[PDB]
Amino acid sequence: QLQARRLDGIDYNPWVEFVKLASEHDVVNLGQGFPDFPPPDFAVEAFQHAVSGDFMLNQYTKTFGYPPLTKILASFFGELLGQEIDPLRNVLVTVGGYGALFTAFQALVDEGDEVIIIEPFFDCYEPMTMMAGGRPVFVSLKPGPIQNGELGSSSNWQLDPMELAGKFTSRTKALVLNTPNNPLGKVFSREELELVASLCQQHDVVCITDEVYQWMVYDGHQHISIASLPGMWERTLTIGSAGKTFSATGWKVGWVLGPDHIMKHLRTVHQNSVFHCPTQSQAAVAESFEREQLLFRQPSSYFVQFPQAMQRCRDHMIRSLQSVGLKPIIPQGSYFLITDISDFKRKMPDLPGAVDEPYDRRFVKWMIKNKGLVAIPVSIFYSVPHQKHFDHYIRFCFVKDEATLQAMDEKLRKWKVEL
Amino acid sequence: QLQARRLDGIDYNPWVEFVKLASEHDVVNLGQGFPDFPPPDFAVEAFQHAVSGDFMLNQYTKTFGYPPLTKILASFFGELLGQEIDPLRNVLVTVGGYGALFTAFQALVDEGDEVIIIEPFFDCYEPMTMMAGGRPVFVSLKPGPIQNGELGSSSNWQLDPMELAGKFTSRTKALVLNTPNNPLGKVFSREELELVASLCQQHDVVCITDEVYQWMVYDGHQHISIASLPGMWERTLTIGSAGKTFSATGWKVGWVLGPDHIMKHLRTVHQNSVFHCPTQSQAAVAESFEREQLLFRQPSSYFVQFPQAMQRCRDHMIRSLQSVGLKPIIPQGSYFLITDISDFKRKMPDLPGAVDEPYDRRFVKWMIKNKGLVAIPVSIFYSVPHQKHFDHYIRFCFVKDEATLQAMDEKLRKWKVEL
Ligand code: NA
Ligand code: NA
């Protein structure tokens, strides 16, 4: 073959097809995992300032990050983590959370290593492990049993201590923790994080912790960073995303925070891949964090206002989707909620599709074509052997304009009353 | 061990030391490979327009490129290459030329593959080959005969056919071509490209061609793209950089052009690493290319005016550097020229440095600290076994403001009085 063997089995991109099918129908697109409204004015203004300020901002900045950005990341997150963070040794600016994840896998995961992944998982964790020669090892959150009185909560999806412990071996290099979780919206508790911490310390494993949804927490639930737990800083890489923080997904700026003895290897990958991140977006992100640090916990702060606003959008969507028999699982965080479609699988078992195509994928195509609503089938966030079991959930994104939620309700009205 | 074996031998970054030392002294920085004056107005205005326009430009764009950008790249470079280019199948937008190179190496280079690299080489080609499991194989340009008191020319650094042919084996996967070359400023001739093309076809080898300095050509020399030669489109990946095209290195936008059967593998790497490139800089680059396509070959176009202006800066620097006994090699393209320091090595051999330290590295440190001028030791663009033999050149960048060149002359006049 022409191509490298590291690419085996990772060429299929579900997202390219998802975008394709939605674009051919008249839809309310609740599949897109980004806002369809503007970022806050201070963020847009920050980028405007960066592209109209010191003309030298048009030229290269420092390899490991624009210094004013690494300074504020170290200060702001050092406070939150209860850790002294050196900007030069403990911070790397990357091309989004995606680039940060990729850099961590390529630095640490080697042929034969195992990587523990928690289902449902942000889908790239599996192919990134594979491309680095690692063997993914899956542990499944166990859905809470639902009574048809009250809706389930993401919090009730359990990480079984015995099942998790049994996944660790001498070959475990890393465990990937995503909290708040996409697609499920689970916000991991202190007790759950202490379990993960205990096993990572026992087995000398690195925890790669994807915290992009840090600020998107609801119902009084608190984001806890595993790197803040005793002894965890020295074995944790913590990842963030400016796009998910400031509702500006197209900025594609992210970072990794961690101890020098691990970070040095990520710096090695960085300097031998992209070398620099763009200068001006970094300046915009630095200015945006400065604004939020100055207004920390205050009523006008984005980190106070925005999750409150999005909690209302969540509640609106939860009520609306029930009108057609979808069963939401209330998320404690993230942009997302999932709905159980088991009643549809029961009443409408035979949908067109390919052999061994999970029901949810077939259902989403049906719903797009017939009802004009887009969701993402949750089976894409499962290992292939588990897709036959976890085939009855779909993911919706509620971080949407009020007009979009109105349009959703119009589709639901038609679904209920027409034909 | 903690880190992946793919990182072996690639952790050392010479650029961090160079940048650090220069920041610690009063200097005219001719080591920085980027302009110290603004990008052209139309380019800065394009970015301003992108960050103040359609608010949805703040959110994710398409994975393989912002469609207006891939459209104009395909149209414009299609015309330049004499090639029908499909924007969806033949174009990938990347995080600069660096990201483009990285994507190519990770898609195609596998364990045990040989990659032919031409010395002097842009330094990342070697470690990128190594991280992909490849074995770098070096062919060395031969500096031309030092003639009748005249300065050397980059054109006369020869690519010996018998040497090059001897480097091709059944294990050769790719050859990396950089034209115009950094650091040398050589613009490869049609004959030289035909030599490379003939061997790539004979041995069924892919040519990765780094053409970031495409527009920076002088003295009537023409940039020829190897992908435009008969039979080469099907085996060539052509790389460019928006930063080097529009004098905006901090934008970090690049691209790869090539046939689908190769590009599909680069897309696999892309979707499993960064996933998206930032939206708004892509919009700026698209607008900038649209401007230049409309004015193509006209006197008011940047691609005509800018290299003409920079040729004047080149000529100024060539004259000035000779005043202290540095011997420039006249470049036909790129931002750079190199000067022979052999007369200094001979008359001043005993500069402080480590036991094995190439003379040029020692000379640059002495020049920074004592003469107030920064250059880059050319030995960093050689394989380690060859560094002791090519230790007598340093690289200057002439793409500088009038004021900077005046400042250079002030340093040089002070040096001359103390030769
Ligand atoms: Na262990
Ligand atoms: Na061959």
Curated annotation (Swiss-Prot), chains A, B:
One GO MF term attached to the UniProt entry: protein homodimerization activity
Biological process, per Gene Ontology: biosynthetic process; kynurenine metabolic process; L-kynurenine catabolic process; response to bacterium
Pathway the protein takes part in: Amino-acid degradation; L-kynurenine degradation; kynurenate from L-kynurenine: step 1/2
Lineage of origin: Eukaryota, Metazoa, Chordata, Craniata, Vertebrata
Protein name: Kynurenine--oxoglutarate transaminase 1
Gene: KYAT1
PANTHER family (UniProt xref): FI04487P, KYNURENINE--OXOGLUTARATE TRANSAMINASE 1
Compartment(s) of residence: Cytoplasm, Cytosol
Residues bearing PTM N6-(pyridoxal phosphate)lysine: 244
InterPro entries in the record: Aminotransferase_I/II_large (IPR004839), Kynurenine-oxoglutarate_AT (IPR051326), PyrdxlP-dep_Trfase (IPR015424), PyrdxlP-dep_Trfase_major (IPR015421), PyrdxlP-dep_Trfase_small (IPR015422)
Catalytic reaction list: L-kynurenine + 2-oxoglutarate = kynurenate + L-glutamate + H2O; 3-phenylpyruvate + L-glutamine = 2-oxoglutaramate + L-phenylalanine; an S-substituted L-cysteine + H2O = a thiol + pyruvate + NH4(+)
Main localization (coarse): cytoplasm
Native species: Homo sapiens
GO CC terms: cytoplasm; cytosol; mitochondrion
Keyword set includes Lyase: yes
Family: Belongs to the class-I pyridoxal-phosphate-dependent aminotransferase family.
Record keywords: Aminotransferase, Cytoplasm, Lyase, Pyridoxal phosphate, Transferase
